Design a protein around this ligand. Structure first.
Ligand SMILES: N#CCCc1ccc2c(S(=O)(=O)n3nc(Nc4ccc(C#N)c(Cl)c4)nc3N)cccc2c1
Lengths: 390, 336
């Protein structure tokens, strides 16, 4: 139903005619049954001898299942297809951005097989399954939909997803939609009934565009535990020799986000882990406030919050390994780093509450040789002085 | 009309550059501009089959009701064809420096009128990002001659000369120079006469264009003779460099030269407005002034050496930029 995306191969390159070798009889019968079912569903098509291209195929026994899955080695074709649009995107911030009252999840497992493929590129997906004992030529097929394991299937699927869901987001700017693994997560601030009607409308929309989402309600629990972050409608939490030190350092770094106080330091780590914590979500109407604490020895701890006692985020900044580094220089690097992180995560740089005297920064600028970015800030009386001396 | 064939430098692929994150209001303004452009048919969406990327961001000119979109075609300009020595266009007049008055004008809409070659439109794709990495950005490509690309003036040369003949024939001393969108009108007369002639040329252009933008009519004045006079020679082949340094109490000192220890030009700048408290604002204004001065004096915008941290400059240079183009800059982290 959706329009196909034209795609070609790298110039000066030809289709895969790689030789294949015979397989087992039960495996070939399973492959025949799977191919017949796909032909019934339209995901596959028959091609005559005019197409000389051939690609390997093999069956893998599913874990604790009678049926075997078909897998086609696309390693040779992955170097034939043109380059696709790859995006170097970092993992989204731990849900710090915005809040939705109610959340539902849906399944899009079959959607990977509902996207039509380009007509010019179909004949390159040719694979053969030889008959038993090869007394007669085997059966040759090519895909009419996106094939699994192909290089360009994820990018095409993502673009199709975005183009399908653009109008729905246009009509309802309040409702947020994300796609994690095979689960489409929808979040809304509206009431239960309105959210239900909107979800049914979205399901009918996706059916109209051909993508399949089951009627049966998904069994996923409210704690989604996505990317090591326990996610709840109101709050969020972090996950509860030569190689042993790196593992411990990594496990200590992740726990420093919402379990504030992470710095014989094993005892303090165990003590702070015993205290449950939580983090509220960002609110757009209220402005952001970031507070700084000088822990010492080149370490700073920053807390981002809207209102006091409700932290949006917590983090730690450490000085760069050099011969000498001034205290105010570390402070400025920390504040600009927090500003950049807030720009990425929320979009608006926050105002700061720093334990520094106003004239100190003015003297610093009069003395500094580079150019630094300084936002408006309000001094707060805190025991750390960080006067910078002289 | 029939389109003009353009190509690339052989052995060179298209540009792919990462897009830096932007704030909320900048993204809203960019979305509005791009929606208007797509309604006008000068911008079209693309799928994932195009692996070429180019940054885009919004600036704000003085007295702007809406931001202005700006694209960083530096990678393409480096990687596009040698289309400007065989089709060089017009050599820069040597009269720009001696006159007392020169006024800048914007002619971007005339560029937007004429269409581009089809088999090149893939290389001018840009991407508007999203906040919190929530969704992939929105991708676009140009259907007409783009702004900030040096191929547009080279292609438009003929139409530009066709409409510039009467004014130049009126009096040979008043000269016109083109550089990207910028159109410099140079005269050595009184301010009133210069302004009247500038307005005459403005509605001359408006009368030629069948399709009165407030941004188009806005321009600023520059006085080359006000500068110090005190280079011995200049080599067009070599690329020149301009170094910026910070002097106390919001002062800045810039040196333009092709070879070290031989200053082609030296200058100082300062403005004690009170909104100067941002160092990046003062640096951006200084760098724009230096680049405009070099463009009046010489053909091309120079290379720049910025005394600033990489990430701070990268994050806080966009909002204070006001020019129509982007120079090439390099960061220095060693004190003098
Ligand atoms: N698995 C899994 C998780 C699914 C998910 C959802 C959204 C994401 C967004 S997001 O843009 O759609 N988004 N998120 C929130 N916060 C929020 C509030 C309440 C609940 C509940 N219950 C939830 Cl799951 C999220 N606010 C906005 N705007 C962005 C990035 C990454 C995401 C991953």
């Amino acid at each position: 139903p959706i329009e196909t995306v034209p795609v070609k191969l790298k110039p000066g390159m030809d289709g895969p005619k790689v030789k294949q070798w015979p397989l087992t009889e039960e495996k070939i019968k399973a492959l025949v049954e799977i191919c017949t079912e796909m032909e019934k569903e339209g995901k596959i098509s028959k091609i005559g001898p005019e197409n000389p291209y051939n690609t390997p195929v093999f069956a893998i026994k599913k874990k604790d299942s009678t049926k075997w899955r078909k897998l086609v080695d696309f390693r040779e074709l992955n170097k034939r297809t043109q380059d696709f649009w790859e995006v170097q995107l970092g993992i989204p911030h731990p849900a710090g951005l915005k809040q939705k009252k109610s959340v539902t999840v849906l399944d899009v497992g079959d959607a990977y097989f509902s996207v039509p493929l380009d007509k010019d590129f179909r004949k390159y997906t040719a694979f053969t399954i030889p008959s038993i004992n090869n007394e007669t030529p085997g059966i040759r097929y090519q895909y009419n939909v996106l094939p699994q394991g192909w290089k360009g299937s994820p990018a095409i699927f993502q673009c199709s997803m975005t183009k399908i869901l653009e109008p729905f987001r246009k009509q309802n700017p309040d409702i947020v939609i994300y796609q994690y693994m095979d689960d489409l997560y929808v979040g809304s601030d509206l009431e239960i009934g309105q959210h239900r009607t909107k979800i049914e409308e979205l399901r009918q929309h996706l059916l109209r565009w051909g993508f399949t989402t089951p009627d049966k309600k998904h069994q996923k629990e409210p704690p989604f535990l996505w990317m090591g972050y326990e996610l709840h409608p109101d709050k969020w939490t972090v996950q509860p020799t030569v190689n042993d030190i790196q593992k411990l350092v990594g496990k200590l770094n992740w726990a420093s986000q919402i379990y504030a106080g992470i710095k014989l330091e094993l005892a303090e780590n165990r003590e702070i882990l015993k205290e449950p914590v939580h983090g509220v979500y960002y609110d757009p109407s209220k402005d952001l406030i970031a507070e700084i604490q000088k822990q010492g020895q080149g370490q700073w701890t920053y807390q981002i919050y809207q209102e006091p006692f409700k932290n949006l985020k917590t983090g730690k900044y450490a000085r760069m390994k050099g011969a000498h580094t001034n205290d105010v220089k570390q402070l400025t690097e920390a504040v600009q780093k927090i500003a950049t992180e807030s720009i990425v995560i929320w979009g608006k740089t926050p105002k700061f509450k720093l334990p520094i005297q106003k004239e100190t920064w003015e003297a610093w600028w009069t003395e500094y040789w580079q150019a630094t970015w300084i936002p408006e800030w309000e001094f707060v009386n805190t025991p750390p002085l960080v006067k910078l001396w002289y | 009309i029939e389109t003009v064939p353009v190509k690339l430098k052989p052995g060179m692929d298209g540009p792919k550059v990462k897009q830096w994150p932007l704030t909320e209001e900048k993204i809203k303004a960019l979305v509005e501009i791009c929606t208007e452009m797509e309604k006008e048919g000068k911008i079209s969406k693309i799928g994932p089959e195009n692996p070429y990327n180019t940054p885009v961001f919004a600036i704000k000119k003085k007295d702007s009701t809406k931001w202005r979109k700006l694209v960083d075609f530096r990678e393409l300009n480096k990687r596009t064809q040698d289309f400007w020595e065989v089709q060089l266009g017009i050599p820069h007049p040597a009269g720009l420096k001696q006159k007392k008055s020169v006024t800048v004008l914007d002619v971007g809409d005339a560029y937007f009128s004429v269409p581009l070659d089809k088999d090149f439109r893939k290389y001018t794709a840009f991407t508007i990002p999203s906040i919190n990495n929530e969704t992939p950005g929105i991708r676009y490509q140009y259907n007409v001659l783009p702004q900030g690309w040096k191929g547009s003036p080279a292609i438009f040369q003929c139409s530009m000369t066709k409409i510039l003949e009467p004014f130049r024939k009126q009096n040979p001393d008043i000269v016109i120079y083109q550089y990207m969108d910028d159109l410099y009108v140079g005269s050595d007369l009184e301010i009133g006469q210069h302004r009247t002639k500038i307005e005459e040329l403005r509605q001359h252009l408006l009368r030629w264009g069948f399709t009165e933008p407030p941004f188009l009519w806005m321009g600023y004045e520059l006085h080359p003779d006000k500068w110090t006079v005190q280079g011995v020679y200049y080599d067009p082949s070599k690329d020149l460099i301009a170094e910026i340094q910070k002097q106390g109490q919001g002062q800045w000192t810039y040196q333009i030269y092709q070879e070290p220890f031989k200053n082609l030009k030296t200058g100082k700048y300062a403005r004690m407005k009170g909104a100067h408290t941002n160092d990046v604002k003062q640096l951006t204004e200084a760098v724009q002034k230096i680049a405009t001065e070099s463009i009046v004096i010489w053909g091309k915008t120079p290379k720049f050496k910025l005394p600033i941290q990489k990430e701070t400059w990268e994050a806080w240079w966009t909002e204070y930029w006001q020019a129509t183009w982007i120079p090439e800059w390099e960061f220095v982290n060693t004190p003098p």
